[PDB]
Every structure is written in C-alpha cells, then in structure tokens.
C-alpha cells in the first residue's frame, strides 16, 4: 500500500508537527504516504493500533502512549531525545539565573515521569529543594492554567517554573497573566518541545528543543531499514523571552 | 468495507479542525467507524491528498481541505456549486458579524487580514460589502496565501506601518490573528486599549486565558456533526435520512481583544 500510519495522542499538543514533517521529508521521496491516527478521536475505544492496521500499512510510527515516543514497526525499536538531560538543562538554566524557589508542572506520560525525576535529582544535586504539583494527567493547556494558579497560590515564593512541556506552559503563561505577574520580570517560565506555538512572537517561549526534527529523521531511517545511527538524541536550550535572572 | 473514514485537512498548525473532528468522531465512532487524517503538507510528496486517502480504501471521505467513495466537504465549499454534498457555516454572515461588531464599537479605520482560501475569499467579500453598506471604505492587505501565523505577523507589521491610522483588525481566521497579536506586542500596542483584533474559528488557542481572543464561532462542532450525518446518509442510502443542516450559523464570542473606540 506504500502507506505509513503515524500514531499521536492529541492534535491539541503540537509537539509532533515538525516530527511528522521530518518523517515525511524522509519517507515521501521514497514513495510512501502518511496518515495519522490519534488516541482521542480516531476510534471509540483505546485501540489505535487496530485502527492503524485497518488501512493495511507497510509500516507504523508509534508516537503515543507512555514509553519512549516514536517506535517504528514492520506490521505485526525506539528513537527519542534524552529526557533526563533535557529536564536537567531546563532546571540548570533556572538555577544559573539565580532562582532558588523553582517549581515543576508535571505530566503523567513516560517522558513526563522522566522529566520529573530529572527535575528533582537536579534540584537536590544543586542544593535546592524541588517543588512540583501532583498532576498526573495528560498534557493539556487547561490543566496547565488551573494547576499554575493553584501552585502559585499555595507557594507564592515560587519565582520560576519548569513546565514539563510547551502546551502546559501556555497554561502557566495564562495563569501569570491572570495573576498580573509579568513574565519574565516577576516570574520565569521555561517549557519543553519548541512547538510552533513557542516560536511565535506573541508567546515567544523559552523552551527545551526536544530534537523532534532529529527524532523524526532517525525514526524514519530506522523504519526504512526494517522495510549506524543514535537512537537517543540530544536536547538543547532555546532562549526566548520568558526567563530572566532573579 | 473497511469501516475507515479518511479526513483531509490542510495544516496541523491551524487548529480550526480539532473540534470538528471531535464532533465527526462522536457521531461516527459509536457506529463502528474509525478515522485517519491526511493533511496537505506532509501526507504525500505532491499535492494529491485524495490519492493518499484512497490508499487506505476508506468507506467514506470527509474533505476539510481547500481544493470515488462517498464524500462530504466540511468547513468549506465552492461558492458557486450546490451545497448538496457540503456542510459549512455561513462565511458571509460570520464576516458581517465581525465587521459590524467593530463598527458598532466605534471603529472606522478597520482593516482585514485576508487568506486566499474559498472561505477566505467569502470573508473578504463580506468584509468589503459590510464596510461599504455602512459608508466606510474597506482596507485589506493583498496576501492571498495560506493561513499561517508567521504571515499574520509580518502582514500585520507591514499593514500597520503603511496605515497607522488603523484601530481595529478583522483577521480572516484565528491562526492569522495570533500573528496579528504578536505584531501588536512587537509594536508596543496594547490590545485592546490601542488596537482591537477579532478572529474567526474559535480555535482552542482563542479559548486560552493567555490569548483570550474575541472571535467568530464558525460552528465547527455543528459542521462536524451534520457532515457526519450527511456522510452516513450516503453510506447507508436505505436507512432513514435525518434532518441535516448544510449551512450553520456563525456567532460572535466576545473575549478580551476588542474594545470601544
Ligand atoms: Mg520539538
Ligand atoms: Mg471552530
């Protein structure tokens, strides 16, 4: 069929956009065509793989669930950025800027769990007590908003927030706006993913590049080899306008 | 049959389709159908998304792109052609509401950021007709490209430089408006204190507290709902044909980006 099914979780979280563009840049020239299946609307149940199989795809890119994001399969093995390192970079950046009361907005995915663990480990290694919310649900803007308003009410001493991802950070930025907190003058916020949203002049969010372009590239090469290279890509800091020394 | 329905959209970067697909899903999945999305920028090397959709051998196809198994065009339509196989909001009415809102707020130097799509053309035409109906000379940029945030940003910076007298902007859609809001920020213009901006689509982005964008609800939920019912009526011609709305009414959603005078 020359069809490749690409599974993602939520169209509302644009972390996957340049990853699919990268996958496409590698696969389409080879004659392949891509179709997307999500976890919220493609089917009534919780069986996205069954939906993928119904199109009789030549291969599948799995960029959902909790494990390592992006796992290529023949028909019946993972490429991802180093989440521990990414979270370390984000946390260290806030520390180097002089922040002591730093909080983490967590998410319940596999990547989120790793970023949370790295956050705590990095804070303690640098002599600081970590603070995180207990939210273990999916990464959504609304939760980022209400979780941030709650977090800052309970801990007004917080001066910087490392959000597990960009979509959650959009919520945090909204919370800051509602609270009248200037970003970055009063509160620093750093996200993760470097989504197209973070790239806009309006949002202009400091974030950890999750190398989603590289992940899509190597994932595609790996799938092609089924139909050397590093399976763990390096993240990096992209400084924009949401962080400042303090 | 495969119980598969292919859904074609243009760009994942423009979230106008999100609640439309959710609505389509709410109607189709309980009946055993599964959905897969085909876009116009990454699903294939060329510009033949229909061929991509056909490769999965879908039972039906929802075409929500600006451009064989049974299909329904959702979110847009050919201004000339019949509406028998399309479900969309009334763009002329929506643009009229947006423009009239700015006019009723006391703005006279109103500008429109246009998009080159079928819906874009309709919104531009209505913008001009509404402005002239109220004795005002319409002003719009010349951009006839696709709806993307970056273009909204640079087009707005250029528009306001050429016409600093402009006090309000009716953006053809929300994603373009995000660019306009960024331009205002870059220019040091407070929204809405200095500049009013109204979008179109009521995207999830417009709904956030951070963006809090005044916009025209394109009834994308109603479109997805009726489009699903319409497609089902074609897939099962022997089953009773329900009451289907081919043209849904848009409405104004006031948030924080517009203000009087
Ligand atoms: Mg990324
Ligand atoms: Mg809508």
Treating each run of at least 4 consecutive H or I residues as one helix, how many helices of chain A?
Answer: 8
> Beta-sheet strand percentage of chain A?
15-25%
| SSE sequence of chain A, one letter per element | EHEHEEHEHEHEHEHEHEE
CATH level 3 topology of the largest domain in chain A: Rossmann fold
Radius of gyration of chain A: 19 Å
Q: Hetero groups bound?
A: magnesium ion
Principal-axes geometry of chain A comes out as elongated
For the largest interface in this structure, which chains are involved and how many residues does each contribute?
Answer: A-B, 47 and 48 residues
| Main β sheet profile of chain A | 6 strands, mixed
Would you tell me the structural class of the helices and strands of chain A?
A: alpha/beta
What does this structure look like?
Two copies of one chain form a homodimer. Chain A has eight helices and eleven strands. Chain A is of the alpha/beta class and 246 residues long. Chain A folds into two domains: 1-82 and 210-235, Rossmann fold (3-Layer(aba) Sandwich); 83-209 and 236-246, Rossmann fold (3-Layer(aba) Sandwich), CATH 3.40.50.2300. In chain A, the strands form three sheets. Chain A has a six-stranded mixed β-sheet with strand order 6-5-7-8-9-11, sandwiched between helices. In chain A, helix 1 (17-27) packs parallel to helix 8 (212-226) and helix 3 crosses helix 4 (110-125). The first copy, chain A, is elongated and about 55 Å long. The N and C termini of chain A lie far apart (57 Å). The interface between A and B is large, with 47 and 48 residues. The complex binds magnesium ion (MG) (2 copies). The site of one magnesium ion has 6 residues of chain A, from loops. Chain B: Mg(2+) binds at residues 19, 201, 218, 220.
